[PDB]
RNA sequence: AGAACUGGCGAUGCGGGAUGAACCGAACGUAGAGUUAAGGUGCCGGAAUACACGCUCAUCAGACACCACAAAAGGUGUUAGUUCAUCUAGACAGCCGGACGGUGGCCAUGGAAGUCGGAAUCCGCUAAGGAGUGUGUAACAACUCACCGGCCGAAUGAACUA
RNA sequence: GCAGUCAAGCGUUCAUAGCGACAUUGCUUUUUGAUUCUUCGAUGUCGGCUCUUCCUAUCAUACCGAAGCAGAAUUCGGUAAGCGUUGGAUUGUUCACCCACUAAUAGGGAACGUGAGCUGGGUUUAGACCGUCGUGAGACAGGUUAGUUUUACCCUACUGAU
């Protein structure tokens, strides 16, 4: 039916700055700069004033509106990413075999090294995606915690480490050994 | 030795799922249709069996 | 090769096509054995399964005490009589084929192994070292 | 394989159906000029990538008869409707709590009063909240749960028909 | 032959792990038939040896998901044909049941692939025996033995050479 035109509202706290030219979206904040290209998705941005910036689609269909919405949620997740920050608390899970996680510099590319997984003789390794520093939590035994900027950084690298721990052709409902993303936090202690 | 704080969370990533009858596709719990385009998006489901 | 035999057997020439009659090396009472099929050989169109030194080959019995006849049994060939080559360059070969009745795991239905024995089939079945005669 | 009323083909060309005797239009002396049928109007082909309103994206699209394949069943894929329902005295979500009590009406009686249960149901305080649902343990004290509903501020849910 | 739809039941409890009747919609040509449209001025007709290629409704392997999957072994399914699918006794055998090795010993065609490639055991002529039928001449998927299998120097396709 082509709903004529709709809009959504993006809102900016004091110390963060969006910059949108063409459809390229720059963000600058306390957590540094983020950049993203939305040009595939075809939307129009309206800036009234700073804290109020409205996105709109005219003469589009169901799917196209459905795209406008997730454009909102995207860019806004970047903004609240550059104020708060993104932190994932993952806790180790092991039964008879404790899992070793080293951080290793190899050609300066930051590889996470996993050893003694299921007592296996294989070495496991994952590249760390860009921007996310990794900590090991204090006074929580067997925890690893990820810290970074955009949701795709932290989320993607985290989940990748999650799925490096799959068990091969054993029972998946009996052996529970692995590493699991549990709590999804924001870097700043308060929020 | 596992303990629920280390265990019951794993059910959410293993043992809490739904499965399509035709394509055996793993699905989140409340999903009302299989996503796969090969199976025909059929709604039929079964809860993934718990231990014993 | 096969399941139950430890050790890495280096390859040797193929001296015993199916039907070949080895002579028995011990108390079994069979004047001679008869091959049928071989453990571990490959399949190729109109190719008889090869047999050779150190092989574990199935066998039947054409001579001697009855209780040996009319039942398939594992057996091992300890003398090839076809010249093969160790990696060290020699070509050594015996003057007749030979074989020993044995269990799947390397134990001997026999006692002592008459005549000389090629060591490639000795050290490959570490059990047979103690039941062995003159080796090499 | 066998018949009936026509028409064709054999005994018949031409244009169209890419091609094919029986399909469509048309029945030819030879030339000229003109206008049309069927079919087409991206390019191969001459002719409008002309106009209009729409609908569909398919990690095995569809493409126009005879002509050369497809079904039964499914799909909040999508679009359009029908009938029920529900409604800014405030919906549906998703958070924040609470659900009081007469009386454990009455009954299994060893005790569960809503709930190892029942042949089966009225009253009091609420702009609310049930002799009444799991945690609970033979029971009991706590809330789960329609709801006052604070936040939320609007239509949504179900069945289908296509 | 294969593939679905629904589901009473079996499956400990339990339609749906796996089964799957009751019915029920399809696909395939690989059998066997029906038709006989084309060839009796002859397309040489079974199987085996040989030799590539192709389709998957994949037997094994790569990668996974379910399981009435603890591990092991095994079952059901998906992306896939890339490679691999045997050695022997008896049979003219297609087929088959057999012993063993096996990662596994899947299914099929390509004019029942390929006779100027072979063999020609079979079937199909002429000889011969027996059983039954026939009064006789004779007849029989009967059962058995014996039985000339031609030419390439043509074009093309290919493999090599200028």
Gaps after residue numbers in chain C (C–N over 2.5 angstroms): none
Q: Do A95 and B10 touch (CB under 8 A)?
A: no
Distance between CA atoms of residues C74 and C110, nearest Å: 12
Min Cα separation A25/chain B (Å):
32
Task: Give a yes or no: residue C6 inside a domain.
Answer: no
Of chain B residues 7-26, which have a beta carbon within 7 Å of strand E? 17, 19, 21-26
* CA nearest to A93 within chain B: B6
State the CATH number of the domain containing residue C43. Answer: 2.40.150.20
Beta carbons of A72 and A55 less than 8 angstroms apart: yes
Task: Give a yes or no: residue C38 inside a domain.
Answer: yes
Q: What's the count of helices (H) and strands (E) in chain B, helices before strands?
A: 1, 3
CA of B1 to C1' of D116 (A): 34
The packing angle between helices A62-83 and A151-163, to 10°, is 90
φ, ψ for residue A52, nearest 5 deg:
-115, 115
Which B-chain residues 6-45 have CB contacts (< 8 A) with chain A?
A: 6-7, 9-10, 13-15
Helix (H) or strand (E) holding A10: strand A5-10
Distance between CA atoms of residues C132 and C136, nearest Å: 11
Range of the domain at C128: 15-136
φ, ψ for residue C42, nearest 5 deg:
-90, 175
CA of A53 to C1' of D64 (A): 51
CA B25 to chain centre: 8
* CA nearest to A167 within chain B: B14
b/e map C86-110, b = 16+ CB within 10 Å: eeeeeeeebeebbbbbbeeebebeb
Nucleotides of D under 7 A from a protein CB: 55, 60, 73-80
Distance between CA atoms of residues A117 and A140, nearest Å: 20
Q: In order of start, what are the domains of chain A with their CATH numbers?
A: 1-85 (3.90.930.12), 86-191 (3.90.930.12)
Task: Give a yes or no: residue C134 inside a domain.
Answer: yes
Distance between CA atoms of residues A146 and A183, nearest Å: 11
- Give A-chain residues touching B1 at CB under 8 angstroms: 95
Task: Give a yes or no: residue C9 inside a domain.
Answer: no
Task: Give a yes or no: residue C70 inside a domain.
Answer: yes
Identify any residues that bridge with A21 across adjacent strands, giving them in sequence order: A24
Min Cα separation A173/chain B (Å):
6
Distance between CA atoms of residues B4 and A71, nearest Å: 38
CA B42 to chain centre: 15
Q: Is the CB of B47 under 7 A from strand E?
A: no
Distance between CA atoms of residues C125 and C128, nearest Å: 6
Q: Is the CB of B32 under 7 A from strand D?
A: yes
Q: Do A91 and B6 touch (CB under 8 A)?
A: yes
* CA nearest to B8 within chain A: A176
Beta carbons of A146 and A132 less than 8 angstroms apart: yes
Closest CA relative to residue A68, chosen from A21, A16, A26, A5: A5
Question: Which experimental approach was used here?
Answer: cryo-EM
Domain count, chain C: 1
Burial environment of residue C112 by CB neighbours within 10 A (0 to 12, 13 to 18, 19 or more) = exposed
Closest CA relative to residue C57, chosen from C115, C121, C130, C129: C121
Burial environment of residue A49 by CB neighbours within 10 A (0 to 12, 13 to 18, 19 or more) = exposed
Helix (H) or strand (E) holding B12: helix B8-13
Task: Give a yes or no: residue C22 inside a domain.
Answer: yes
Beta carbons of C29 and C68 less than 8 angstroms apart: yes
Beta carbons of B35 and B28 less than 8 angstroms apart: no
Task: Give a yes or no: residue C60 inside a domain.
Answer: yes
Instruction: Report the 3 state secondary structure along chain C.
Output: CCCCCCCCCCCCCCCCCCCCCCEECCCCCCCEEEEEEECCCCCCCCCCCCCCCCCEEEEEECCCCHHHCCCCEEEEEEECCCCEECCCCCEECCCCCEEEEECCCCCECCCCCCCCECHHHCCCCHHHHCCCCCEC
- Give A-chain residues touching B15 at CB under 8 angstroms: 173
Q: Is the CB of A1 under 7 A from strand D?
A: yes
DSSP code for B32: -
Beta carbons of A51 and A18 less than 8 angstroms apart: no
Task: Give a yes or no: residue C5 inside a domain.
Answer: no
């Amino acid at each position: 039916m082509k709903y004529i035109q709709t809009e959504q509202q993006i809102e900016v706290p004091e110390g963060v700055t969006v910059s949108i030219k063409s459809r390229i979206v720059k963000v600058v904040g306390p957590r540094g700069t983020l950049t993203k290209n939305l040009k595939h998705i075809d939307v129009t941005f309206t800036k009234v004033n700073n804290q109020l910036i409205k996105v709109a689609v005219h003469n589009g269909g169901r799917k196209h509106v459905a795209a406008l919405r997730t454009v909102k949620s995207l860019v806004d997740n970047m903004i609240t990413g550059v104020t708060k920050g993104y932190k994932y608390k993952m806790r180790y899970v092991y039964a008879h075999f404790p899992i070793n996680v080293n951080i290793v510099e190899k050609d300066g590319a930051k590889f996470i090294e996993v050893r003694n997984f299921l007592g296996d003789k294989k070495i496991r390794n994952v590249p760390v995606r860009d921007g996310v520093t990794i900590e090991f939590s204090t006074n929580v035994k067997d925890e690893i915690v990820l810290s970074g900027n955009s949701v795709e950084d932290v989320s993607q690298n985290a989940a990748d480490l999650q799925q490096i721990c799959r068990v091969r052709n054993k029972d998946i409902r009996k052996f529970l050994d692995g590493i699991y993303v549990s709590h999804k936090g924001f870097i700043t202690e308060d929020l | 030795i596992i303990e629920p704080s280390l265990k019951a969370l794993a059910s959410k990533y293993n043992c809490d799922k739904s499965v399509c009858r035709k394509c055996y596709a793993r699905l989140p719990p409340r999903a009302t249709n299989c996503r796969k385009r090969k199976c025909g998006h059929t709604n039929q489901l079964r809860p993934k069996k718990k231990l014993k | 090769s096969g399941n139950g035999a430890q050790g890495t057997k280096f390859r040797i020439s193929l001296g015993l096509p199916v039907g070949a009659i080895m002579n028995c090396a011990d108390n079994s009472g069979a004047r001679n054995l008869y091959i049928i099929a071989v453990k571990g050989s490959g399949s190729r169109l109109n190719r008889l399964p090869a047999a050779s030194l150190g092989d574990m080959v199935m066998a039947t019995v054409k001579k001697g005490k009855p209780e040996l006849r009319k039942k398939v049994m594992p057996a091992i060939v300890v003398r090839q009589a076809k010249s093969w080559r160790r990696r060290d360059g020699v070509f050594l070969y015996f003057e007749d084929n030979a074989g020993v009745i044995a269990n799947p795991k390397g134990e001997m239905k026999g006692s002592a192994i008459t005549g000389p024995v090629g060591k490639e089939c000795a050290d490959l079945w570490p059990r047979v070292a103690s039941n062995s005669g003159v080796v090499v």
